[PDB]
């Protein structure tokens, strides 16, 4: 068995920084991407940043706190919130793997 691992801290350090750098390059437009990917990578980061959605609290303009891109428009914004709530009972790891798997599949770094 054994699930916890005090030695598996490196992967955490790398992953955290990775997302920070990757998301930083995107928002700054340091890499050519499409609207769909922008909204997809963003929707995942948002869900992982704020976890599952909660209509009880509402927000609408909550995405304004997270920079998903330099030229954020109602379209990109909408797709961000839509995809976020569109995701069923998804787990945190799923989101982390979603963006990481996407960035790795695109060869961003």
UniProtKB/Swiss-Prot annotation:
Residues annotated with Phosphothreonine modification: 91
Modification after translation (UniProt): Phosphorylated at multiple sites by different protein kinases and each phosphorylation event selectively modulates the protein's functions. O-glycosylated; contains N-acetylglucosamine side chains in the C-terminal domain.
Subcellular compartments: Cytoplasm, Cytoskeleton; Cytoplasm, Cell cortex; Nucleus
Top-level division of the source organism's lineage: Eukaryota
Function, in words: Protein 4.1 is a major structural element of the erythrocyte membrane skeleton. It plays a key role in regulating membrane physical properties of mechanical stability and deformability by stabilizing spectrin-actin interaction. Recruits DLG1 to membranes. Required for dynein-dynactin complex and NUMA1 recruitment at the mitotic cell cortex during anaphase.
Disease: Elliptocytosis 1: A Rhesus-linked form of hereditary elliptocytosis, a genetically heterogeneous, autosomal dominant hematologic disorder. It is characterized by variable hemolytic anemia and elliptical or oval red cell shape.
Subunit structure: Binds with a high affinity to glycophorin and with lower affinity to band III protein. Associates with the nuclear mitotic apparatus. Interacts with calmodulin. Interacts with CPAP. Interacts with DLG1. Also found to associate with contractile apparatus and tight junctions. Interacts with NUMA1; this interaction is negatively regulated by CDK1 during metaphase and promotes anaphase-specific localization of NUMA1 in symmetrically dividing cells. Interacts with ATP2B1; regulates small intestinal calcium absorption through regulation of membrane expression of ATP2B1.
Protein's name according to its UniProt entry: Protein 4.1
Organism of this sequence: Homo sapiens
Covered residues, full protein: 292 to 396 of 864
